[PDB]
């Protein structure tokens, strides 16, 4: 459970340091969080995939009882809403060619998010030139790694549309994380909480990305203390 | 000129009454004539001048905008139909997403292409969800939309709620220029109940009676062209 | 509920036409009323509804999205929204939801899903071009293509609350052109509405 | 007298693999068919292009004269139908972003197929990286070679939709054939006749693709 | 020859074209159907051999041009005099705009067939081609949209423009819209749709249409 | 007094191949843009293309005005959107992005901008616009499926389709800053199949790039990213 707003919780940490989140997939796990908190994670991301909304419920239920960091929903589809979470990344897949992933899915799930109490964090979601499975399923045109002006352009548009958070996604298991240059440019152009995930395995991966401008660092694939150490090194 | 935040000005008015905006098209008359229309429209007690509604030459836009910014003291707000709808002579821009388009260009593409320009200029950006209702008019057709049916307010509410969650503080229920009937009072009423958005309404609003129903139905802002 | 619903269907179709009751999500009372009214099954579409249990007719999931899969059901109309303009509703959603259907035991009935004018809400959310009521040649064309692709079931959807049900001409023509279990829904309120649809060729009626 | 092509296929699959030879009507030649049967092909696939339906008819007629194995149409558009064939791969290009290649073209060509007697084998058609010309013309998002889970997802969806055959397409002339992992995975997940084509030139390529799970191998 | 055939006639009067469908009657019956100035052959995506025989049957027995009116790549046949090589402009599907055309271009070049560049626009309600073509029919109350497309088509080099109400359409491409489109471009303006009565033809032709098509 | 731009082209094409210099208004001021033009003209460029980006039309006008004052070669608009129209130009490439998956870039944008082009005096040159691998930013923004470099038949197919639809000009686009220009084989095939003024841009930096591209069949050569480099390029094309 988490008493207060997750968004204020984020600003609270950001006064002093950078934020780390651990991404858990229910299909893969059985209702790791505790280990990642012993490493120094500041929150648990839950979802990322299209899977039956009951393995989610059980994993979500199990977590809310036993951990004291926020559970934030990371929906890969409308199957990603669960009342047992503390907040949801209410995201738009901005660089999709399919309106379903941009606003369609979002419209169908809004009543569910509202009927429940869940805090909704507005987030622009942008796939970078590898992109992993989400890039493919999300019908995206991945942003080339050497075209940061494009990423920055979408970051600026997201902000003007009211999205206070921006997520640079290289896709799960990306060989290399989002380019340092791309992150820096986005940080230069907006006042958004800049989140970066994908391909971040080593503390050095975390140092480069954190140093590049990222306010938040997401990881799914202790390794965590190595990572969180890395993000402190800068 | 207007100097201060157009959004605070809106909230200032909303404490006491509902807002009215006049939509002028640069394509349809000369800059002098629009000032005439504008200056005239201020006599009714309009609270601002919306400028756009069409995809047209960005030089007529500039010229009409310049002429207005000099001669009126109410806010000049851009109502862009494309990236051609941006001008530094305006006080704010409705930075809008055409939510029920089947084409990503009208949802995020155009917005992405014009954002650097909007930031390079000083223009204040009001985040706005833009939703076309049946019949949808010309913008419905050009915008590659599936107009929200008039007997499907649940759909309107669904997109309005999502817009809010995405950070869009304003919502525009658009029936399109020359709409035979304004957006149904039912749709407006439901949308107002479900969100904490400034609910803007345009399309087919001609008479005071239309304005009484639409405003009375829940609309915080009414637009007439 | 043992066992195959497709066999349950064929067994009945030997003697009469099938009726299915569509429940939208918890009042068991509605199912039981329609079951003593002589319905042959419960369609469940928009979520547990473990409440059967209390029923002895099949529970068939009628999904509006990937959120429509539940292990307490007996079968799923595993459907493709054929006349959608969005690949998501034709095969995309189906591909993302396929593993769950296999992970559970749920029997999957292959079904073509076709929206007819006016199309209702499913037509709109589904990004469809509803088949016009005076264009049955199109309906038949899609029924045949669906069948050639292996879809043994075909669903003529006018959308919930349709002012008029699917045209009689359209139903008849599709049945003449294929060897499918022909389901028709939308706008069916009166027995007379049910008389037209049933008489025209429909093997299954939904209300 | 003549048996169905699907039944013909199952008869072989009881004992051994299955091989089909892909002929393009546009590119030339009953010589090629006759030659490939002496090698041990089990059938002749006819198509691969969107091209005039007269080059097809003529090639189909000539073939139907000189061989005793099935002629199976492999259509690139509604122009790929000819009454001189024994069966048609009635396919949906599943990972296309364009509804025309998924169901639209199929809807337009259906009556023509019905008017003729042609046996229609229901087949899911999936383009794998790199994808070749069909990948480009077909408006596809090729399934990446290290994302077999995606391939398996579509094989399962195809099956649930009634498609008894599944075609893993790497595109004509692809440098690498569809990966063994993907083939292995897709065969594990469905009870479909699993066809695999593209880039299979050497005997080793066919041994690997066959060994990985492919029930049918295609060579053009 | 066929484009010149057209310009010569329009000097004095308006052109009329008769639309015959190969699917709907036998070639003998088709030769029979043929004061019309030409025979259009198509309207559908249909068996491509029904096309060939009907074209042959036509090509021998008449002295007016047989002009292909393709609904898809199945619509090219070597026995015709000309082809409307057309783009379905207000389609949401790139296949009907340029995709099909690219797939069919080599066939047209391989034959000698004369290709007339034509913008093809479905107007409300639009009929079957509008539906199959994945169109957003131009509303009957928006001639500005039609004209905008007529102008863009012309700038792209399309000398002919076709205002389509759809086969069997209950009502006209509207009087007006034709007028506006004619005012705004220098194209050979073709109109089809539910033109049934002699009264309809006076209206459509008089309104600005250079060409009237009837099936 | 002034000559249409297409006739200007035909005149040069009687004897030699054409060179055009592509300036982006966003990337430098009008003063600096005049410098590029004037330098590019002392090297034998035959014209100045104006566009290349989706950017506010006030930088365009100012760059366009400044040019119209100081040079006597034609100013041709190279629009990236309807914001790419300026009344101060001599002609516009009225183009369709043929291998886009989005109808907006194929005809939609063109339809919304047509009234403006007609209302102004601007000469409209009909042009098929085809993005080749890698495609650059326009390939990405334009929602394209870039023609693979080993698929000249695809390029030729669209070139043939463009011509039949009345498009007298064809542009093979490798994208700004492309590591390598459009393949020779691809250009050759496109020239063999049509009688279009065949334009090629992208990745053309050196005189050899231009010699090879020119030699392959290209009637026209566009270059932007790179001042008297032009003299090498125009030399190469001889
Ligand atoms: O590659 P990993 O570390 O699993 O990252 C997951 C990705 O979804 C974060 O955005
Ligand atoms: O009905 P009018 O007065 O044209 O106003 C409609 C306007 O909201 C369209 O943008
Ligand atoms: O109109 P009813 O009877 O509810 O039927 C609708 C159903 O077929 C689809 O939801
Ligand atoms: O011609 P190849 O490369 O063998 O490929 C066969 C077929 O699968 C391609 O359509
Ligand atoms: O059959 P009608 O309604 O006369 O029209 C046919 C032709 O106009 C179709 O383009
Ligand atoms: O690589 P450059 O020289 O900038 O050329 C690109 C230009 O041709 C865009 O089409």
């Amino acid at each position: 459970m988490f008493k207060m707003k997750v968004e204020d919780y984020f600003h609270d940490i950001l006064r002093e340091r950078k934020i780390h989140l651990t991404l858990i997939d229910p299909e893969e796990q059985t209702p790791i969080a505790r280990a990642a908190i012993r490493g120094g994670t500041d929150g648990i991301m839950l979802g990322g995939s299209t899977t039956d909304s009951s393995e989610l419920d059980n994993t979500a239920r199990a977590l809310r009882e036993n951990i004291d960091v926020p559970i934030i929903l990371f929906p890969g589809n409308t199957t990603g809403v669960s009342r047992y979470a503390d907040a949801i990344f209410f995201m738009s897949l901005l660089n999709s060619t399919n309106p379903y992933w941009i606003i369609g899915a979002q419209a169908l799930g809004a009543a569910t998010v509202k009927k429940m109490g869940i805090e909704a964090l507005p987030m622009g979601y942008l796939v970078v030139e590898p992109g992993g499975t989400v890039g493919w399923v999300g019908d995206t045109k991945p942003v080339p790694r050497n075209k940061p002006d494009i990423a920055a352009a979408y970051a600026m548009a997201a902000e003007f549309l009211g999205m206070r958070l921006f997520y640079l996604e290289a896709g799960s298991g990306a060989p290399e994380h989002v380019p340092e240059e791309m992150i820096a440019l986005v940080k230069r152009c907006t006042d958004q909480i800049l989140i970066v995930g994908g391909g971040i395995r080593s503390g050095e991966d975390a140092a480069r990305v954190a140093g590049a401008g990222a306010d938040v660092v997401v990881t799914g694939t202790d390794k965590i203390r190595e990572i969180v150490e890395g993000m402190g090194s800068v």
Side-chain angles (χ1 to χ4, degrees), chain A residues 1-2 4-26 28 30-33 35-52 54-128 130-186 188-220 222 224-228 230-234:
Chain A
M1 176 63 184
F2 205 64
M4 68 174 76
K5 274 219 281 170
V6 177
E7 202 174 353
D8 291 334
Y9 174 62
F10 279 0
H11 284 148
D12 276 13
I13 303 171
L14 280 169
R15 288 189 286 164
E16 312 284 9
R17 64 179 172 91
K18 287 165 182 301
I19 302 175
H20 176 279
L21 298 174
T22 303
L23 175 56
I24 291 168
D25 189 10
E28 220 74 44
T30 169
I32 8 168
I37 290 161
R38 292 192 298 269
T41 197
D42 301 305
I44 303 298
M45 282 171 58
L46 195 58
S49 58
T50 307
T51 311
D52 92 288
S54 69
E55 265 171 357
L56 181 65
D57 279 6
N58 294 338
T59 298
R61 214 196 326 264
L63 284 171
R64 184 195 177 205
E65 293 173 20
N66 298 282
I67 63 177
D68 300 351
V69 300
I71 295 130
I72 310 152
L73 297 169
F74 181 53
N77 208 341
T78 59
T79 44
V81 187
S82 168
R83 73 182 57 79
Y84 300 114
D86 295 296
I88 178 168
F89 285 147
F90 196 102
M91 41 171 43
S92 184
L93 180 40
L94 296 174
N95 58 332
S96 175
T97 69
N98 195 320
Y100 178 77
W101 300 116
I102 305 169
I103 187 61
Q106 292 73 5
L108 290 169
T112 297
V113 160
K114 230 225 169 44
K115 184 250 173 275
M116 303 166 177
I118 319 165
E119 189 196 340
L121 312 170
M123 180 181 282
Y125 189 52
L126 198 81
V127 185
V128 177
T133 288
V134 61
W136 194 98
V137 174
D139 294 313
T140 68
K141 35 172 188 171
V143 177
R145 300 175 64 86
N146 64 21
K147 293 285 183 295
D149 285 357
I150 301 183
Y154 276 76
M156 276 184 284
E159 175 163 73
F160 283 139
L161 288 163
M163 290 169 244
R164 302 173 232 112
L165 293 86
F166 203 77
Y167 198 123
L168 291 170
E169 173 71 277
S172 188
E176 286 167 330
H177 61 73
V178 173
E180 303 90 305
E181 196 185 11
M182 192 178 281
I183 301 165
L185 188 60
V186 167
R188 188 168 101 205
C189 293
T190 61
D191 288 287
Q192 289 164 317
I193 299 170
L194 175 54
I195 315 205
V196 180
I200 295 148
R201 305 179 202 83
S202 66
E204 283 176 7
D205 291 341
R208 298 300 283 182
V209 171
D215 288 315
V216 182
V217 177
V218 186
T219 62
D222 252 317
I224 306 302
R225 194 172 11 251
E226 196 212 343
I227 291 174
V228 176
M231 298 168 49
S233 74
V234 319

